Design a protein around this ligand. Structure first.
Ligand SMILES: NC(=O)c1ccc[n+]([C@@H]2O[C@H](COP(=O)([O-])OP(=O)(O)OC[C@H]3O[C@@H](n4cnc5c(N)ncnc54)[C@H](O)[C@@H]3O)[C@@H](O)[C@H]2O)c1
Lengths: 494, 494, 494, 494
């Protein structure tokens, strides 16, 4: 069930969050935050720079020192505290979802029923792992007792984008904290507000001071002070591919801090003639147009077998005409705006290029209205491999539909790309499903569904979509460091 | 490729194997061993009894004492000794496959190409696991360091049937020895011979005395001495269901020793209309007619969907006439005899119930030849759930073809049984393949194949087909005993 | 930390709990429940026999049918419900502790601070495993995709004693529910009351009907009907070795249900001369005398090195003199009664046997008061291996103190026993700690502490103290059944 | 007993190995290779540059294509190929040890008894892991079947140093090959000859062509072509810290390939007052002076407690005089040369900074012999924290003995460094052993031993000693990439 959004929500939390207290920027500067549906200023937030980052890192190092309350408390206690944070986010679910909507342009129902729900579930999952992270006893050669410890890494920097502020934040801090690390959080400059509200709940939940620090700010300033800091042990980064290159570089030229990258995507989704046609049209559609295309996991190219091609295209055009734009808080609106003017412009350039290079425009292709950064649902057929809308990430409401003839061809083309985050496959045949999913070079493959991400399963990129995994067993374990202890004993019995 | 079999084998090993030496029996009694194809006595073997088992248990307890060679040896050295046993069985492959054919009635091609091949790779799978058995370090509540050790259990008794002497022996002593246990092997009275040759290979490979002891003999004497012994820690039994119930009670009345059981089977096999019919007919045919039906994993209930049913019965009867009985060492022969008269009588008494209860005989139904215990490849149509031939394990070359009309009803009918060792499912629909194999109450389900076991997978019964698993990670780890050590420490840090 | 007990608690729940409803017994019979400190009847409780168990089993079997809410529910959702049960138990903590005190004779501050706390922590641990139980994908030989599933077993009978009612209950239903089983709970006839109150919280928590059924009653009636039932898939039993023999047998002669056993104990405790003496005396004291010795993990035999023997004994006797017996709800009382006349007399026969066989009585050795089943804390010195107090489990406030001289001797002596549940070792030396703890034949070994069980550590017996483990990763996985699925594929790539 | 070295070995293999064929360099240039004990030339070796790397990468890619022999062979068969390579190195043990001594200046007894033994065991361990690398089946939210695959990554560049050619080669090709990757091997320019002989044995074992390619050459040319290649999926580097940063950077600006890093070291070793002093001097001496200081795992800083300091010093000086320098091949020699002139220079630079900074020269401190790159075993006492000899890696026969008094101060001091590969602790106390080893920030901690590396445990850096681990379960799994496959099903039951 879905409540009504808050009518007169007020912004309360705008300061930096360091050592469980609220700080002004060292410089005294603030930066503005805009509603993308109206273009108007919501508020100004304290702007973090290198000198604020230094303060956050000192506090996180102190919280991590041997004998501190966060290091000596039972693993199960780390767990209870993460589970309590989940309880408070659930209690404030209406507030947090109204605020996601205002700041990031998300359809309200989507933000309440999906984003907030996934964020609460990710934290609860992670909470359960805290006392079940285990090492090994090893029957090594020789007269030794040998074992391993999965220890916390230390101080972790968490840097991420604007498209899903609550989910992104949950899936970085959840794994980090349940392994016992302390953290420095740098949310995207476009959408800092829900991150700062979660900070007020971290103090309420009873986290020790310095365990979680949240410093809103820009990229070359705050983001780059974290990646090159000499006393940060790890940075987990989600964002664009070009910036991930700068992060790896920064890490190398400073202290060789561990790096995790989750970067750009152009995700293929393949529909064979033997697929359930209706279900695939619907899933592939939601694949591309969810959050107005503003999603790393969206279906960006649609390979559709020749016999069902014309009929797939026709049904996708019809499905795309069922949208109403406006303020995402208004009931009856299911198409929000793009995040800002820069993004809007990148999307329109690519749309325009598709017309230029001779893809066929089926519907949309233009901006929507006069105010707010709205773009029409846009579908393109007769798309060929070497067009720009086929290669470049659009991050907008733009579907590409292409023809394919045989199986071995469509695998070749779906893999002919420097990206590899996610891929779809639709077929009701057992052997086809298994062998094609194995053959696709992507870290997640969805069979007969799309957007089916869960907390229990690891997700991440092949190739230039990044390295490392988030969530599941495997992803949680990436916030640990392994130590082997090997002790001499006087006699050894098996 | 297939060599020719040995034409005149010297039987060298007929004595009990205890502490790496050969012993006559305490009583002096021997028992005869017969070739099922010719009825001729191959040799007499030394008959072990309670007092011989008593000797064997003392040798295995001595070999398991702390400070002994077998306990102080590096785990990777144990694995190396098991790899060496496999190399020695491989050098003697031709000899062992001939001997298995002569004693067990196994068609030479199956025994050389499948049984010896599987037995070799099984010991090699287990060899690798030895230095990879690992416990845990655990972040327990309180100021403690806690870990587990997966120790060896102790002295293990291993009792098995006659249907596949080399495979059964490998999958029991492989796992048991890789975890560091000592063992008392009790092969079937019908087929003790190959196991005695393996004894001579264990010796030359260099296993410490008393680690492996073999004592051939009868069940109510030597077997019962093992299950009832106050100093045997675990018994692993493969055999009939009624005998498994005796094992369990004797364990309880003596020393509550650990029990693993692998019992009777009546395995269903379900073929839907959208299956590859050529492939499915052939696989179901292999599954029932492999080893003259003398296999626990044999298909015996063929549920076939009504629209392909008549065709499947016609094609199955045609495949069934491509056979040639005779001495299983003869080139060309692909149908052997059954193990002895008591079993030949039991199969004929079930076959006649088939005629009498209304099933229609499509082919066979009678005895073959003059000498030896041969039975004709028999097929029955129109079989229903109430008939004895659909309820009782036949252990013979007798196919039952049953009809089904719906998915829900046939799952129901395959599950309505106290058996559950194995099952098979033939369909090319992804959804049917996954949902039906999840719904079947059996330890192994094979999809679009049959008789497709591997060393790397675990195997065993649901319900009254047994409890416990053999092979794979999980099955290997069932020959360990878990010990927690928890030590006070002065400070704890994550 | 600790409130005042409820002064006049009123018994609310006394009926059988089946299908989320309160049922009268079929026969009409009800059985009495007594307060062990006054010998007065508290109330009568409904008495289940065979026919009531039969209703419990059909309800558990229906809740476990495919398609049912309990089966189709997500695993994270099972977890949620169990964590909610832990919250309601936390909410009713004072109520359940008063009632535990009254029924079982536990000192109230122990019941509140230790038993209720451990009960809440165990459920929360298990809740966390619900969506982290995982099978494997296995690279088998051949063109196959092969995987395992850790399925729930089915209907589980859960039968336990009277010494820690709330801990026993958590540690059975927690692991079983988190795996997705349904259950029949047969609490001890001495102490059915807190179990029945928990049953009231199962409904409030929102478990589907039939997932948890509670049937109070006696052993040979309610218990034997469960263990011998044809539609119960597993029985987990805790209790006397003699009854454990009967359960194992009943399982054999009914349906070979899986059995797990956690039986009698006589736990050795070794104190070397190079230990923290002060702390060893106090730990060993709490080990013996906590819950008036009515605990399977209690220190019975106390081996103490010759050089420090006389001093250890002086300190132990002095430490045993500081007790005030009386009503377990009364402030300043730290010694409750034994549970009933049958146990009081068992313990008095064994105390008298110590006097007769020549051990030196240091303190106590008789009853306290003339109403209630109180026994003076009792200490024997000069105890030898042949005396009955050194061999038999007493389950009462009686400490045995024995001399030893050499390390190799004391190890033999502590391992010379059919029991093997727990052991203790006290030394400051790394090498002694590790080698002696490896050498002791017990399921748990505590080094420089005692009573240090946690929810994340497995626990269970060697030899005739049982088989199977409870809690930790390993114990939780004993409530699953393993299925291998192997599918034929047209091509395989690594 | 130990055999004598081969008397007049002839170098057989000097060319690049690509596609199981021997190639001349594309330019036709070769580079010289020197015996460090005589200064004399051994042979010239083809010098790979960028154009040669491009050929090897091309062959690896071709050998990794889906459908190829190395992709479609069973995992168990990759294991048998790796095990055959090890049997063959065992057979060529005498030849390979001798050649390792000649090229790497390693004492012969060492090269034969330790290095060759370790390299055979490491390969046999990884062989065991091939068909035991196992993904997961996952109970995710929703109506889905979800599982993971641990696939091979693809083309892996392997770059390493000259201090233990066979060990480093085995510890990288073993984990890489056993997960099913193909590889480009880049041996150090100073010690390529053993790599090349191993390339001949790879061919003989029957590996598919292209699976292992070996391109000897210089670092700025062949090494940097590997790390900058657009078609190389992963680079595992072992070497100096300085060069490790360039690899990380070159990977960023090319294709964001996966990077593993094992770098410089300055390993602490703390010896407490209550330690077995005799054992501790021995292990500590061996720790430093093995390989004449040329091991990254060598002890470099010895912290010795005040009560035993002077005795530790004078005992270490006596131990340092048991050395006879010369050609490692002449009987009696147990002290070999450093590798070349530039290393011989760095070491003496630092030894002379020892004299000038304050430290007391107890023995050695200058060069040895007329010819060769020998240095006297050198011990320093009274060493302080700010000295260059206590901060920078010496990689030579130089022991630093420093004094401490407090457990808390020595831990801070041991951890106050940007390095973190290995550490040592010597004590008889249980509590100090566990707590100090838990507090040290290093990847391996050895307690009451040193140089106790084993194949079954993981090893690698904390901080700027690198990231990633090698060997053991966790190390083997670093040469995989996780793919999640989530399929829609029509019904889900637990
Ligand atoms: N579950 C499985 O993996 C599996 C595998 C192969 C065979 N089987 C079963 O084995 C049966 C055929 O073999 P079988 O007839 O030799 O079985 P069986 O019960 O007649 O004898 C099996 C073994 O137990 C011994 N034995 C007999 N009585 C005993 C007693 N009282 N105490 C101790 N040991 C005793 C026998 O001497 C023999 O070694 C079939 O029912 C088949 O399903 C099961």
């Amino acid at each position: 069930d879905l409540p009504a959004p808050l009518t007169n929500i007020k912004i309360q939390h705008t300061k930096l969050f360091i050592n469980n207290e609220w700080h002004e920027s060292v410089s005294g500067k603030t930066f503005p935050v805009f509603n993308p549906a109206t273009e108007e200023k919501i508020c100004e937030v304290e702007e973090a720079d290198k000198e604020d980052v230094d303060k956050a890192v000192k506090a996180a190092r102190e919280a991590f020192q041997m004998g501190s309350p966060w290091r000596t408390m039972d693993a199960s206690e780390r767990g209870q505290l993460i589970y309590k944070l989940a309880d408070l986010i659930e209690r404030d679910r209406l507030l947090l979802a109204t605020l996601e909507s205002i700041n990031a342009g998300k359809v309200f129902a989507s933000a309440y029923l999906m984003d907030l729900d996934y964020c609460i579930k990710a934290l609860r999952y992670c909470a359960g792992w805290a006392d079940k992270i285990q090492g090994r006893t090893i029957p090594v050669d020789g007269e030794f007792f040998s074992y391993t410890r999965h220890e916390p890494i230390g101080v972790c920097g968490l840097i991420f984008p604007w498209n899903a502020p609550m989910i992104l934040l949950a899936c970085k801090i959840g794994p980090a904290l349940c392994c016992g690390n302390t953290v420095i959080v740098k949310p995207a400059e476009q959408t800092p507000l829900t991150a700062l509200h979660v900070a007020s709940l971290i103090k309420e939940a009873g986290f020790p001071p310095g365990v979680v620090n949240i410093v809103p700010g820009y990229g070359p300033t705050a983001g780059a002070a974290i990646s090159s800091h000499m006393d940060v042990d790890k940075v987990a980064f989600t964002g664009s591919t070009e910036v991930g290159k700068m992060i790896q570089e920064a890490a190398a030229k400073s202290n060789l801090k561990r790096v995790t990258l989750e970067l750009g995507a152009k995700n293929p989704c393949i529909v064979f003639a033997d697929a359930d046609l209706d279900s695939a049209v619907e899933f592939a559609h939601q694949g591309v147009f969810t959050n107005q295309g503003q999603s790393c996991i969206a279906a960006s190219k649609l390979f559709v077998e020749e016999a069902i091609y014309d009929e797939f295209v026709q049904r996708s055009v019809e499905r795309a005409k069922k949208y109403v734009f406006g303020n995402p808080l208004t009931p009856g609106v299911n198409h929000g705006p793009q995040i800002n003017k820069a993004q809007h412009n990148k999307i329109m350039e690519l749309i325009e290029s598709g017309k230029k290079e001779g893809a066929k425009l089926e519907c949309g292709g233009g901006p929507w209205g006069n105010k707010g950064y709205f773009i029409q649902p846009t579908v393109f057929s007769n798309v060929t491999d070497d067009m720009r809308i086929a290669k470049e990430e659009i991050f907008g409401p733009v579907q590409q539909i292409m023809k394919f003839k045989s199986l071995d061809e469509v695998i070749k083309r779906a893999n002919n790309t420097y990206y590899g985050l996610v891929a779809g496959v639709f077929t009701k045949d057992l052997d086809k499903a298994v062998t094609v999913s194995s053959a696709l070079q992507a870290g997640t493959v969805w069979v007969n569904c799309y957007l089916a991400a869960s907390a229990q399963s690891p997700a991440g990129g092949f190739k230039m979509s990044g390295h490392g995994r988030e969530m599941g067993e495997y992803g949680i374990h990436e916030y640990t460091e392994v130590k082997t202890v090997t002790m001499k004993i006087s006699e050894k019995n098996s």
